[PDB]
């Protein structure tokens, strides 16, 4: 009837305009998308310039449950350095290579 | 009547849709965003800790009464050091690893 063309051409229009929002907010989703993919670029290549020498082998004293590692290096000293979740600490044993 | 409604009703209808299929399309760009934000925060967390100046092993050899506290270094030379109020020289006596 002239009831049930009203119903849906007014449900229509509501979506629409709901989506419309949507559509922006999304085309500026992007522009975020952007700015963290970068980020994500620079932040791995701190951690590869890491990878990359000066690298010093030190090897391991004991490990501690506080979140940090007793490192004896070959240079001298001991010192204390906290993880990463680039290492176990299961792989770490005193006598560990690192 | 309902042949009005009906074009209007049409035209709604068509745009609806159109909206409907970009937004699609654009999902797996937020998909990516909420990714990287992640990948973001991780990232840096990690690099910071370990950036972040690495602390040495010392062991009281000995202590003044003058409030400072000589810390045979890991190193292998001696320093007098100062005390903190996070740890207090009566938290400490000589052979406690600091």
Redesign the interface.
Same mark, same amino acid.
């Given at each position: 009837?002239?009831e049930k063309? /009203?119903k %849906? &051409?007014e449900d *229509?229009?509501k %979506?629409?305009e709901l *989506?419309?929002r949507? &559509?922006d907010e /999304?085309?500026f989703?992007?522009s975020?998308?952007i700015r *963290? &993919?970068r &980020?994500?670029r620079r932040?791995?290549s701190? =951690?590869e310039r890491?990878r990359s020498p000066p690298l010093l082998v030190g090897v391991v004293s004991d490990i501690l449950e506080d979140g940090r590692v =007793?490192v /004896?290096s070959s240079t001298?000293?001991?010192? =204390?350095?906290?993880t990463?979740? *680039?290492i176990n600490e299961e792989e770490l044993k005193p006598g560990a290579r690192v």
């Open positions: 009837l002239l063309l /009203k %849906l &051409e *229509y229009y %979506l629409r *989506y419309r949507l &559509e /999304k085309k989703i992007e975020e998308r *963290y &993919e &980020e994500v932040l791995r701190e =951690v890491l =007793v /004896k001298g000293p001991k010192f =204390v350095v906290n990463s979740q *680039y």
